[PDB]
Structure 1
């Protein structure tokens, strides 16, 4: 079952074996992935997070972010550790109490402390629309139509050795899949459909790192939502999905009753499908309980290309139709060297006092805010442009902005900008060497909003900045509950800070 919008959520340690290999994990709701948190557009979510963690090898503190939800007036509830709160300590709980006005779509939640989400704290978050403009395109849309794609590691996140390459050991689809090495025939996930019906498949990348080439043998996929944003219908036969992105697609169960491979090929780790790695099963009702015998094509006919997507609504693009045509046009220098990422020459290291708390205590320009050089102010009620030119090692980097979605004025692998009708989304691949992926948004949400690469290993290695949006109105716009005020004193006492 789905939980919420008002629910408890316990964070525990447990052993799991999603690929047949046992290891300890950090779990929400006792499962990997965690349970789906759900409600309707405009609902009040009250998610009381109980930190019950005891194993220090995966950190006993936690903080949870609700990825893609704007948190307008509730910046304190956003979750990034040392940006909007101090972590919750073990044996304590915290009520994330917020509203989702004006949003409906497919989201997710994840730890936002260190690389802890990699250790298991990740799950879907769905905001249904009772008046969804896409409702008539499908018949079924429920917990059974959510598809999560996850990377899974045998080595614990905190135990990844300095100086060695990090790659995953299995791809998990709906929490199950097979290991790339020492493969065993552990159970695969099954997604069941009924011949003749149409399904809103909610595809969620909960990856810590790889992008996936997602496909379903014999089928094609009609995209109707991108990172929470309704799109015009776009039919594809493969979707390259980067870490933290979401799509809804219509799956028409229009093939013969049978079994079809679901494929998710990561860009690193195991290549191909030998032994059933990188795989799940689409099973029609009435099919034999056996593995598919289908193949992929050598070449896909209609892969997703981001510039092909367009909003369903007339969203346009803010600003003027040329580079720099914004109130606050930025170009970030995104770099990597010697194990650390930087933005404009500064590698992100979380501060002792959360950015939001520094603001509430009276720091009132970004030069006053710590970490020095990692916080950039944005003016209120302004069009912002951020160019994100690629080139830094470890690409393609999926960049994500908290508190906002954005128009993707320029996409990967295409030098032409689009000031008319590009998709809006919240996580975008910045592409490859020489690209100039560029985003736009308007500043109508006071508070400190994290901008970072969503490859969690890169975030940990510094690939982030904080946009302190409308510093002057942050305090008035974001009244804080006592429990939030209590977080840092409890954390600092527990940690002898």
Structure 2
């Protein structure tokens, strides 16, 4: 049931009841999560998105981001509304036509207009590698080995009251789970394995907000990929996964034939597993069809710690081995007050003219780009360092950069940087008060790339900036199709702008 690399994707409204409570949703492919889009490394994806939305309570416009894909030469296809495009209006379609050179791993797609992905438009995106260096570590890698973790809300995203705390109502594992309050015995997801086989489980957080503590009773997990980056094998018994992150792990079906709880404990919302909340079932072939009776430990023996991850390939770290040892070293001031986030004293409010369009129209420095103060120029062919010191309320904040992955030179909860062999990824927790999480990358992809907290509620409240990488080369590097050029006039007409 995987679709792609060339496919239609219809976006519609429908009622769904993934925890036994019915509500309307915004869906790709008629389901929550959406269908898996898949192809092989280097493929041309042609995803024609049909906007068939009619319920204004969840917005009738849309735009879809392909999270983690670099979009080199195709910045217009990246998806963030008002950064790279105007939204697609209802009754229209748009062909996201791009290539995935040099990438293979586990990705996802989601609406990138307002908080609309929280209403349901989220799904997995897998780029297989026919020559995968990790192939011999497992026997099975297919749609049945994808595990999605999602938060689900009973209140519609646009209808979350101003100044009330937002928490989810259920954790969904592969689209099913039980509500934290008024819990009913709605069906749980089942992941089926065969005794003796080894599985590449692809763990995808499609969360709008919480991080999860993910574990499988009786089993351990050997991490082999992080946000699209192959890793050295790291065996763990629990993974803390933040919004938008992905891990692949090998699961060895080496326990007695039976039923085992799969656990995903969010950092907010319901605590524990009473009534089967926060749970799914790992069932071996031949086991009785019944709920697991297993328990978690009190304390996990080998939780994932991010500094223990290292790339499988010799990726190194660009620049020099000390703070500020980059061509463009930046330190962002990340703050929250009075309901709004800010970066360097500016709260992000999406502009009327998308940033890419402003560049292609001739705005050639970042001081000329709107929103004022929210667009930072980066020079071409340069090592960039970005320090993201934590402290702003609502953390721990998972920061994400479009167009790039990056070396995580300093991670949460550990003051020691690693300039030798840190993992590279695309979404990183910036940790807690006093931390100084820091990332490095090189600028070889001209275009405006969003940088933001991936808790969608924080993005909406302004926790974002745009890196306008290599403004002078953006137009030549990113030729745009006529259909893209048509988006802004159509949106502005339909909205009387």
Alignment TM-score > 0.5, same fold? yes
Spell out, residue by residue over 1:214-262, the C-alpha distance to the aligned partner (whole angstroms, 9 max, x if none): 0000000000000000000000000000000000000000000000000
Spell out, residue by residue over 1:282-314, the C-alpha distance to the aligned partner (whole angstroms, 9 max, x if none): 000000000000000000000000000000000
**For structure 2, which runs of at least 5 residues remain unmatched after alignment?**
none
Match of 2:284 in 1: 284
Match of 1:351 in 2: 351
Q: Counterpart of 1:49 in 2: which secondary structure?
A: strand
- Cα distance in 2 for partners of 1:496, 1:314 equals 53
Please give the TM-score of this superposition, normalised by the length of structure 1.
Answer: 1.00
- Cα distance in 2 for partners of 1:492, 1:441 equals 36
1:161, distance to aligned residue in structure 2 (A) = 0.2
- Cα distance in 2 for partners of 1:231, 1:365 equals 38
- Cα distance in 2 for partners of 1:433, 1:107 equals 30
- Cα distance in 2 for partners of 1:156, 1:137 equals 42
| 1:115 and 2:115 correspond | yes
- Cα distance in 2 for partners of 1:389, 1:197 equals 43
Match of 1:27 in 2: 27
1:281, distance to aligned residue in structure 2 (A) = 0.1
1:496, distance to aligned residue in structure 2 (A) = 0.2
Spell out, residue by residue over 1:337-373, the C-alpha distance to the aligned partner (whole angstroms, 9 max, x if none): 0000000000000000000000000000000000000
- Cα distance in 2 for partners of 1:435, 1:146 equals 33
- Cα distance in 1 for partners of 2:237, 2:130 equals 29
* Total equivalences in the alignment: 497
1:439, distance to aligned residue in structure 2 (A) = 0.2
Q: Counterpart of 1:452 in 2: which secondary structure?
A: strand
1:150, distance to aligned residue in structure 2 (A) = 0.1
1:434, distance to aligned residue in structure 2 (A) = 0.1
- Cα distance in 1 for partners of 2:464, 2:228 equals 23
Spell out, residue by residue over 1:440-461, the C-alpha distance to the aligned partner (whole angstroms, 9 max, x if none): 0000000000000000000000
Q: Counterpart of 2:282 in 1: which secondary structure?
A: strand
1:3, distance to aligned residue in structure 2 (A) = 0.1
- Cα distance in 2 for partners of 1:44, 1:452 equals 27
- Cα distance in 2 for partners of 1:52, 1:343 equals 35
- Cα distance in 2 for partners of 1:158, 1:178 equals 23
1:85, distance to aligned residue in structure 2 (A) = 0.1
- Cα distance in 2 for partners of 1:264, 1:13 equals 28
Q: Counterpart of 1:437 in 2: which secondary structure?
A: strand
Please give the TM-score of this superposition, normalised by the length of structure 2.
Answer: 1.00
Q: What is the root-mean-square deviation in Å for CA atoms of aligned residues?
A: 0.1
1:103, distance to aligned residue in structure 2 (A) = 0.1
| 1:197 and 2:197 correspond | yes
Match of 2:93 in 1: 93
Spell out, residue by residue over 1:139-158, the C-alpha distance to the aligned partner (whole angstroms, 9 max, x if none): 00000000000000000000
- Cα distance in 1 for partners of 2:225, 2:394 equals 28
| 1:413 and 2:413 correspond | yes
- Cα distance in 1 for partners of 2:204, 2:8 equals 23
Match of 1:125 in 2: 125
| 1:492 and 2:492 correspond | yes
Spell out, residue by residue over 1:403-448, the C-alpha distance to the aligned partner (whole angstroms, 9 max, x if none): 0000000000000000000000000000000000000000000000
**For structure 1, which runs of at least 5 residues remain unmatched after alignment?**
none
- Cα distance in 1 for partners of 2:59, 2:416 equals 44
1:317, distance to aligned residue in structure 2 (A) = 0.1
1:476, distance to aligned residue in structure 2 (A) = 0.1
Q: Counterpart of 2:98 in 1: which secondary structure?
A: strand
- Cα distance in 1 for partners of 2:90, 2:116 equals 14
Q: Counterpart of 1:136 in 2: which secondary structure?
A: helix
Spell out, residue by residue over 1:389-413, the C-alpha distance to the aligned partner (whole angstroms, 9 max, x if none): 0000000000000000000000000
Spell out, residue by residue over 1:114-147, the C-alpha distance to the aligned partner (whole angstroms, 9 max, x if none): 0000000000000000000000000000000000
1:24, distance to aligned residue in structure 2 (A) = 0.1
Q: Counterpart of 2:436 in 1: which secondary structure?
A: coil
- Cα distance in 1 for partners of 2:56, 2:300 equals 45
1:187, distance to aligned residue in structure 2 (A) = 0.1
